[PDB]
């Protein structure tokens, strides 16, 4: 009945757009879909009994141009171990550091990881750490559709093997990874265009077996409200 | 004989890629070629008598969601007047502010306008001001091919209608425009791949009357050195 509830139906998989940057330069981008989430790894493998879709960050390559810098990037990648795990449990996203690279995270802008208020936290090594909750996001998305709130942020940025670049240019960090659950991008874009008319717009949730939905703003906000009443709040 | 010298030959037109961001969101991109350069403008009417190709930044749109914020974008755009002019003469890029929006600029990275050290300057209104010199760029590029220095920067970022976001998230700025002379982007990528081997790689200089070139690193570096020797310092 409510198409947005498919976001949370057990067995469905979200698409995650994973984009990696070495020293401010995009070097990798893949979309990933896996019930056990994903693991950012640096090709040491080394275990094949870990859950999660292994996302292998590319070698920095060999060039006579930035040899010294790429050497550091390579070292970081060589210390990823089991990697950075990111996975979903219902309305919650979880991250865990399985290797030896300390990793810090924030939910931030699409284009800018460090908004200036520091990281949201450090990814823990021996337990799951919560990095996203769809509950508040949807509450904030509804506020946005009502004009009385900015659009909620949904871009997960990870800084791997270095401190968070607070008050520093993020392009100096060796290994920055952005992870966008693309359903959230689509939800935000749908609200933005939905505010401009009472006509139908198309939103694609980018989850398993998804198809584009055609909704007016009224129908969309009704569904957001129905969705939010079905989610958990502490 | 030196293909790169085509960059500076009389009558040459460079391509410039203009990308605009409203509050950290890309809203517009257009590539221009014009001997008189370009002008970043707000409306598609009012001033149709000035030299330089008009690049009209899009209306923010009228949504119930962020109209308070976009209202500010809209007012900024409406104050652009004759616009922000950008053009080339020889090995130099020049800019001039023809309307009412104070505009700060810096040469920086493709993805990050404000690396923290502040703006290179404010674009002057009553006189043109130099915003880029290909001479030092090519010196720095050669240093890069020799692994003795970082990749030279070539992205011109303009903050329109507000102070430069020094130690501030650039995405909070209402109107940020990136201009890339795409030849410079191509020259850097060529050096980048050229360092990986001595195989030939292709470069499109994205300039008038220039077909793609296929050079080894050795040839490219030879051409860069010949180029810089004929440039003004």
């Amino acid at each position: 009945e409510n198409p947005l509830k498919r976001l949370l139906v057990p067995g469905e998989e979200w698409e995650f757009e994973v984009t990696a940057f070495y020293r401010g330069r995009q070097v990798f981008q893949q979309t990933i879909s896996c019930p056990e989430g994903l693991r950012l790894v640096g090709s040491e493998v080394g275990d094949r009994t870990l859950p999660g879709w292994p996302v292998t960050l590319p070698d920095p390559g060999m060039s006579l141009t930035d040899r010294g810098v790429m050497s550091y990037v390579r070292h970081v990648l060589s210390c990823l171990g089991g990697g950075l795990a990111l996975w979903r449990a219902g309305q919650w996203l979880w991250a865990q550091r399985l290797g030896h690279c300390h990793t810090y995270w924030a939910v931030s802008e699409e284009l800018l990881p460090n908004s200036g208020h520091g990281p949201d936290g450090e990814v823990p090594k021996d337990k799951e750490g919560g990095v996203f909750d769809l509950g508040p996001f949807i509450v904030d998305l509804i506020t946005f559709t009502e004009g009385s709130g900015r659009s909620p942020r949904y871009a997960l940025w990870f800084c791997v093997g270095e401190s968070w670049p607070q008050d520093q240019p993020w392009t100096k960090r060796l290994v920055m990874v952005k992870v966008v659950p693309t359903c959230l991008r689509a939800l935000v874009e749908m609200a933005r265009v939905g505010g401009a008319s009472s006509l139908e717009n198309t939103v694609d949730l980018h989850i398993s077996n998804s198809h584009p939905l055609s909704l007016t703003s009224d129908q969309y906000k009704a569904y957001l409200q129905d969705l939010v009443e079905g989610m958990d709040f502490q | 004989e030196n293909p790169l010298k085509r960059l500076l030959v009389p009558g040459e037109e460079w391509e410039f890629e203009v990308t605009a961001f409203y509050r950290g969101r890309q809203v517009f991109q257009q590539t221009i070629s014009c001997p008189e350069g370009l002008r970043l403008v707000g409306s598609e009417v009012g001033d149709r008598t000035l030299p330089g190709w008009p690049v009209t930044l899009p209306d923010p749109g009228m949504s119930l969601t962020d109209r308070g914020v976009m209202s500010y974008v809209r007012h900024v755009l409406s104050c652009l007047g004759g616009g922000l002019a950008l053009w080339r003469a020889g090995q130099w890029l020049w800019a001039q502010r023809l309307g009412h929006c104070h505009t700060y600029w810096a040469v920086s990275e493709e993805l990050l306008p404000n690396s923290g050290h502040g703006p290179d300057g404010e674009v002057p209104k009553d006189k043109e001001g130099g915003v880029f010199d290909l001479g030092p760029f090519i010196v720095d590029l050669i240093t890069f091919t020799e692994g003795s220095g970082r990749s030279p920067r070539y992205a011109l970022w303009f903050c329109v209608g507000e102070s430069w976001p020094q130690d501030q998230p650039w995405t909070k700025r209402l109107v940020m425009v990136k201009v890339v002379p795409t030849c410079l982007r191509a020259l850097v990528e060529m050096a980048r791949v050229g360092g990986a081997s001595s195989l030939e790689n292709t470069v499109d200089l994205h300039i008038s009357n220039s077909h793609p070139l296929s050079l080894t690193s050795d040839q490219y570096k030879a051409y860069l050195q010949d180029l810089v020797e004929g440039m003004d310092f």
């Binding site: 709130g149 900015r150 | 308070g68 914020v69």
Partner: peptide
Amino acid sequence: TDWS
């Protein structure tokens, strides 16, 4: 209006 929310400027955050």
